[PDB]
């Protein structure tokens, strides 16, 4: 019943930067871990990044290391993702899934998911 | 789950306190009744006056 | 562990005396000690089981007492066949049935 609203999607040229916002209101956000994952238009799901309940332990996907950064605002119960140095392969769908646990690297997986937002990287 | 063995073993040890030391109990039930009695206390008979 | 000590080793008395022997333990054993009489020529025999419980068939002259860490045996009559070696044994500590040193008794 929890709500996960995502925005920031659109069409941008390769090499530009943008922001994605994911806001949650149906649960307590101060003690849950959150993750960004990627579903390709013609392939399966892939994990991208995630943050814990507090901004101490942080992880990124190997294919996106050094390019993407995440931020978390517990005051307004939301998180942001900065899209930098975009290339032709980043035109997929992105979800904002909620981890069952509190840390970043735990055997507990994502509990509740949100509707994906479509981004396009082309001229 | 939700299924327990009803038998539990007493782990008697000499290091336990008095409240946990084993105690042997023998209970005598007396069928004291007007029926023909066969268990009798030590007593001497007497001539039939 | 546990260590048992015999304060006396050899004691001299007469046929009409009273003798006492003490056995000390390293720590408390909760009155769980036994007293054994060992004739040099035959099999040893038990005198006292438990702290102060007298075994059946032996004369009431022997008397055991004491609890905790120290224990004592006393003979009041000293009949002329009471020449033997007396041992104190504990049965409470983790070392199973460890015996103390002997206690020679002679009459003079």
């Amino acid at each position: 019943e929890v709500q996960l609203v995502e925005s920031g999607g659109g069409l941008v040229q390769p090499g530009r930067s943008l922001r994605l916002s994911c806001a949650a209101s149906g649960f307590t956000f101060d003690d849950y871990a959150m993750h960004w994952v990627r579903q390709a238009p013609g392939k399966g799901l892939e994990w991208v990044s995630g943050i814990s309940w507090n901004s101490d332990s942080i992880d990124y996907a190997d294919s996106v290391k050094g390019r993407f950064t995440i931020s978390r605002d517990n005051a307004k119960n939301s998180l942001y993702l900065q899209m930098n140095s975009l290339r032709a392969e980043d035109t997929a769908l992105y979800y904002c899934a909620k981890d069952r646990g509190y840390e970043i690297l735990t055997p507990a997986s994502f509990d509740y998911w949100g509707q994906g937002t479509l981004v396009t990287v082309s001229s | 789950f939700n299924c327990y063995f009803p038998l539990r073993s007493y782990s008697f040890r000499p290091t336990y306190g008095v409240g946990h030391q084993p105690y042997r109990v023998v209970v005598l039930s007396f069928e004291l009744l007007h029926a023909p009695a066969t268990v009798c206390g030590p007593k001497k008979s007497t001539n039939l006056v | 562990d546990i260590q048992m000590t015999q304060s006396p080793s050899s004691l001299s008395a007469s046929v009409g005396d009273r003798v006492t022997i003490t056995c000390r333990a390293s720590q408390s054993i909760s009155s769980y000690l036994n007293w054994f009489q060992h004739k040099p020529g035959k099999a040893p025999k038990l005198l006292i089981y438990g702290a102060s419980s007298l075994q059946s068939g032996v004369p009431s002259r022997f008397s055991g007492s004491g609890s905790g860490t120290d224990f004592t045996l006393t003979i009041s009559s000293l009949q002329p066949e009471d020449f033997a070696t007396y041992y104190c044994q504990q049965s409470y500590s983790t070392p199973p049935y460890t015996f103390g040193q002997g206690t020679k008794l002679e009459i003079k």
Binding site: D31, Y32, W53, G101, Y102 | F1, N2 | -
Partner: protein, 48 residues
């Protein structure tokens, strides 16, 4: 029981419970709670 984060063993968390009805059958009916050791009181008569 269903808390996301517990405290450390040295700083064990103490919670006082009163002025409510306590359903001990809920804790008795969850499979993952493998270890249920109780001393000084029978688990069956906890409800009454």
């Amino acid at each position: 029981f269903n808390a996301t984060r517990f405290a450390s063993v040295y700083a064990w968390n103490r919670k006082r419970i009163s002025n409510c009805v306590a359903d001990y059958s809920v804790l008795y009916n969850l499979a993952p709670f493998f270890t249920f050791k109780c001393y000084g009181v029978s688990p069956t008569k906890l409800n009454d």
